[PDB]
């Protein structure tokens, strides 16, 4: 018998992004080919199967720095980190291959699916 | 020119609630008349004007325990904490006064608005 506020989840995510933009309560640095990205562990886990596995590990849950595989493109990561906090994906012809590869590595199934569909349409 | 994934914010919130239910990466205990509630500071801040003010304070941001005003009803708090993580509010005739008072204290404007409307309909 609950009532539901339609815009609540979107409003929560918008506020989480405002905290990210002001660097409030960020608790991890993700290092990608020397580029550094500050974020909230909980948001990373909520969006990515890879981060979910990393931060539920009894040793890794306590790390303040996570280094990604050197094949990971920093721009591809940046686009995906923006998607995690906003639901918006900046997918372009010039970045689609790097975005799909990073999303496969991060285990972000819905992003991988739309990249596969957009690539299939271009062939 | 971004594309948007409609269900992303809802999916993020659902995963944050799964982390709460398994007590993963909770970083604060909220004490309400001896009852204790574990949660994520970022989610509390994203939902409440009161928690936003508390955890942006240079001294309070570092506290692992927050004690609420003794007038705050633990059931009212529990219903609001469930709303924060799910967008669902368990509003009933028997709890509406305690829910509205707790939401006014927590500065959760949309909850206060629906409580005022539901109370106005009963008079």
């Amino acid at each position: 018998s609950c009532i539901q506020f339609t815009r609540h989840a979107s409003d929560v995510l918008l506020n989480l992004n405002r905290l990210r933009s002001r660097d409030i309560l960020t608790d991890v640095v993700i290092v990608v080919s020397r580029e550094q990205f500050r974020a909230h562990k909980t948001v990373l886990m909520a969006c990515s199967g890879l981060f979910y596995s990393i931060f539920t590990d009894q040793l890794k849950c306590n790390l303040s720095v996570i280094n990604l595989d050197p094949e990971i493109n920093p721009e591809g990561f940046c686009i995906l980190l923006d998607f995690m906090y906003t639901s918006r994906l900046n997918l372009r012809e010039g970045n689609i291959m790097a975005v799909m590869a990073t999303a496969m590595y991060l285990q972000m199934e819905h992003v991988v699916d739309t990249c596969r569909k957009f690539i299939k349409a271009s062939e | 020119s971004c594309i948007q994934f409609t269900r992303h914010a809802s999916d993020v919130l659902l995963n944050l609630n799964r982390l709460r239910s398994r007590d993963i990466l909770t970083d604060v205990v909220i004490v309400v008349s001896r009852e204790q509630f574990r949660a994520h500071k970022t989610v509390l801040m994203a939902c409440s004007g009161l928690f936003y003010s508390i955890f942006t304070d240079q001294l309070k941001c570092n506290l692992s325990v927050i004690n609420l005003d003794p007038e705050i009803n633990p059931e009212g708090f529990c219903i609001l904490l469930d709303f924060m993580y799910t967008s669902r509010l368990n509003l009933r005739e028997g709890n509406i006064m305690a829910v509205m008072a707790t939401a006014m204290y927590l500065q959760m404007e949309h909850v206060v608005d629906t409580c005022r409307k539901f109370i106005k309909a009963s008079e």
Partner: peptide, 4 residues
Amino acid sequence: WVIP
């Protein structure tokens, strides 16, 4: 607000 809606009935979910």
